[PDB]
Design a protein around this ligand. Structure first.
Ligand SMILES: CC(C)=CCC/C(C)=C/CC/C(C)=C/CSP(=O)(O)OP(=O)(O)O
Ligand SMILES: CC(C)=CCC/C(C)=C/CC/C(C)=C/CSP(=O)(O)OP(=O)(O)O
Ligand SMILES: CC(C)=CCC/C(C)=C/CC/C(C)=C/CSP(=O)(O)OP(=O)(O)O
Ligand SMILES: CC(C)=CCC/C(C)=C/CC/C(C)=C/CSP(=O)(O)OP(=O)(O)O
Ligand SMILES: [Mg+2]
Ligand SMILES: [Mg+2]
Ligand SMILES: [Mg+2]
Ligand SMILES: [Mg+2]
Ligand SMILES: [Mg+2]
Ligand SMILES: [Mg+2]
Lengths: 275, 275
């Protein structure tokens, strides 16, 4: 298909999978918005290989090999996701380094793994979420990447910790645990408690500890918003606040994360306030 | 109750929970057999606290505190398991050190944990299984403990690896994985493969690698049997060969460990051959 229809393919992907990020980045100007769609499609395919694919090691390495060919300028394909990403790399000075780092992060979910410390958690969050922020920065803040980089990495930490805090039960059912073992020990929340899906006072202490780290990272990220160009401030600030609002959503539902999303109306409220 | 009935309480525990070890150690002379029953009851209660209890951290620490009081000679109780173990410590020169080490091993299952390497696996096997061998040695080989110690530790490795190899699916359903991550990577058996309960050629390669380590440890342990007193040779050799036979049982059932036990008749055959 042509470039317009390849980008529209990516528009469908982001709209189907993230009401938050599709709504936030729809507010960007045309070519920046389309580039975000193409970058999102790259991230979605990598994560879905590892989290939903039936042969994730072989499929992720094949994806990595395709990205190598893409970066050499030699990938000949009819895949709309690569057609769109080719244009985005041509149109904006996208840096391949965080794209490779995403793949490093996805490799971390191929085999059994225990998060021991908060440092272990941030290492994982850096490679699977902070890298997304870094992929986007040349589109969102041309010429100002080094100025906003730290806030973008920390926004990744904030969003990934939020994701983890929302998904404790979903991940448990999928035989994954991202809560640090050392905080489980600190607060006296055992593996048997977690397996029993217990929402007790120790769980809440641990959950709030992580949530407060996320809130600190969101605050640090939002402090950098004046350094973005004006046309990126509502998209980035809106994405940040809409995703942060998952935390208070869970609190308002009494920390029940073993069975949470921000309502459509609340997303509109946050976007209006940014605007 | 009196001492005879306290030991009979422990006899019921071992008979209910292990046809293999009850049958093997029933062949010991009277007082050694009864001491093994009491030691088994100690190990069973510790493991069941951690693997079946609803508050395993609090309950295991309370068990540890009771054992501290027991070792000080100050535990006043009507618990038949402690009455029997008091007599066994009085009657044979039992060493408390491996009993404490068991509790260290049980603590390892209180919180999320990933076995990375074979060294990690042997560290775990030492504390939960090798320690049982060490608790028993003053009963099984009085005056000859240092001579047979290494074989007893390695018999622990052999039996625990066998247990793990039989229980991969049972442990997975309980959100535990004891297969080393580095062997999963070596053989290309992913977390998604394991979650999918796939019995493929990579699984079999990994399973056989561990089984061959266990077989080596069984061989080393059995090589020490002539150093045991005559009355312990059939109990120890019988326990070893009956538990080893789980490995070939699984092989004969095509490695299907996601849904295996040695038949009663095969246990009798092994005991007769020892005799
Ligand atoms: C480009 C853009 C604005 C957003 C990209 C969003 C996506 C799809 C990132 C894929 C990698 C991540 C963050 C997985 C989350 S953890 P998990 O274990 O729940 O999976
Ligand atoms: C904008 C900027 C500078 C930094 C933010 C970068 C982004 C969008 C990271 C995405 C983080 C997450 C958790 C995406 C959802 S993956 P899913 O499959 O669970 O949904
Ligand atoms: C005294 C004697 C002869 C035998 C004692 C046997 C017992 C009950 C040992 C308890 C600790 C162990 C080895 C648990 C096995 S691993 P797991 O995770 O399946 O539990
Ligand atoms: C005799 C000697 C010198 C060494 C052997 C020591 C023993 C008996 C170790 C027990 C090992 C296991 C796996 C017991 C079953 S625990 P479960 O609950 O899975 O049954
Ligand atoms: Mg993922
Ligand atoms: Mg995912
Ligand atoms: Mg998630
Ligand atoms: Mg156990
Ligand atoms: Mg057990
Ligand atoms: Mg077991």
């Amino acid at each position: 298909m042509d470039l317009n229809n390849a980008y529209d393919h990516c528009k469908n992907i982001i709209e189907k999978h993230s009401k938050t990020f599709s709504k936030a980045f729809a507010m960007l100007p045309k070519h920046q918005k389309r580039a975000v769609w193409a970058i999102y499609a790259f991230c979605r395919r990598a994560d879905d290989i590892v989290d939903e694919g039936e042969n994730p090691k072989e499929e992720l390495e094949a994806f990595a090999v395709e990205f190598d060919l893409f970066m050499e300028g030699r990938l000949e394909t009819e895949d709309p996701c690569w057609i769109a990403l080719q244009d985005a790399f041509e149109r904006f000075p996208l840096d391949p380094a965080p794209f490779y780092e995403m793949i490093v992060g996805q490799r971390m979910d191929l085999y059994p793994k225990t998060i021991d410390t908060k440092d272990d958690l941030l290492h994982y969050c850096y490679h699977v979420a902070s890298t997304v922020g870094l992929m986007l920065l040349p589109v969102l803040a041309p010429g100002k990447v080094s100025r906003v980089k730290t806030g973008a990495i920390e926004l990744g930490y904030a969003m990934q910790i939020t994701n983890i805090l929302r998904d404790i039960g979903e991940d448990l059912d999928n035989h994954r645990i991202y809560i640090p073992k050392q905080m489980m020990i600190e607060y006296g929340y055992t593996r048997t408690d977690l397996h029993n899906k217990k929402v007790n006072e120790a769980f809440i202490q641990l959950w709030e500890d992580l949530a407060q780290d996320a809130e600190h990272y969101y605050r640090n990220a939002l402090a950098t918003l004046p350094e973005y160009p004006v046309y990126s401030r509502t998209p980035v600030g809106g994405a940040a606040k809409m995703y942060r609002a998952i935390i208070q959503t869970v609190r308002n539902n009494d920390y029940q994360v073993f069975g949470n999303y921000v309502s459509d109306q609340m997303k509109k409220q946050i976007i209006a306030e940014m605007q």
